[PDB]
């Protein structure tokens, strides 16, 4: 089993008046555990999972200092990139950053990563080997040399293979009641007559965790994609997820069709009939 800790930053310039809006959220796998929001009163990194409140005042003081620093780096960035891209001061613009680390089944560092976007487009990302950068354009080529020169990668590497993974292990342990618990989907099937000749079969997966899931219809033991609808996975809003898939079939023929569920919470795939 691999697990991930990830951090997602967003800054939207507010030209006309003020500093940019800065929202920062942290996740372990599919669980959010911290947030910061420049519009909030506290001006503090805030807890969003029960198991992180375990952490002392000095954690919240450490995290807050670091994340206000990050909002300032994004503030400079927005201005630097307005100029790189020869944009006016009139318009609103966005920077987005994501970084994180994974551990493997050995509980050891498995993976690291870091990506940057300007107005919704790649700008610069760290390479998988964590020694070097990938610039999307000639602007980003300026940033790459600056960061090469500053030895940013080596310091980012030290963090992701160290501090990041260490604290990941910490959170997994502290919140194992939920972070290390898999909820298998609660499945069922519904049937609706659209006419006298035809009917809709809808296969539901409710209340599962993680979010990763596979739902497919088979007819007489072969996959069927024709005449189906498959909604995107959606949060229930209690930390679990939902999904469904539907097929349109001739009335009286429902027995040919099986729904097939794949999920980590299940040791063996599930098969459902009418």
């Amino acid at each position: 089993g691999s697990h991930s800790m990830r951090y997602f930053f967003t800054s939207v310039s507010r030209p006309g008046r003020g500093e940019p809006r800065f929202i920062a959220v942290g996740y372990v796998d599919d669980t959010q555990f911290v947030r910061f929001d420049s519009d909030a009163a506290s001006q503090r990194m805030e807890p969003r999972a029960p198991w992180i409140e375990q952490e002392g005042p000095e954690y919240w003081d450490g995290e807050t200092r670091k994340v206000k620093a990050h909002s300032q780096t994004h503030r400079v960035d927005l201005g630097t990139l307005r100029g790189y891209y020869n944009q006016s001061e009139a318009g609103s613009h966005t920077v987005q950053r994501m970084y994180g680390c994974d551990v493997g089944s050995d509980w050891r560092f498995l993976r690291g990563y870091h990506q940057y976007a300007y107005d919704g487009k790649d700008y610069i990302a760290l390479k998988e080997d964590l020694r070097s950068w990938t610039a999307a354009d000639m602007a980003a080529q300026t940033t790459k040399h600056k960061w090469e020169a500053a030895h940013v990668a080596e310091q980012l590497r030290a963090y992701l293979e160290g501090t990041c993974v260490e604290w990941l292990r910490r959170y997994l342990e502290n919140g194992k009641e939920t972070l290390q618990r898999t909820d298998a989907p609660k499945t069922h099937m519904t049937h609706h007559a659209v006419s006298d000749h035809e009917a809709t079969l809808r296969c539901w997966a409710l209340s599962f965790y993680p979010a990763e899931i596979t739902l497919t219809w088979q007819r007489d033991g072969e996959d069927q994609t024709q005449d189906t609808e498959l909604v995107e996975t959606r949060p229930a809003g209690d930390g679990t997820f939902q999904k469904w898939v539907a097929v349109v079939v001739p009335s009286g023929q429902e027995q040919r069709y099986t729904c097939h569920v794949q999920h980590e919470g299940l040791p063996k795939p599930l098969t459902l009939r009418w």
């Binding site: 951090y7 990050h70 780096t73 400079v76 960035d77 990041c164």
Partner: peptide
């Protein structure tokens, strides 16, 4: 636990 991020683009 976040990184200390102080490099600008």
């Amino acid at each position: 636990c976040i990184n200390m991020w102080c490099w600008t683009v």
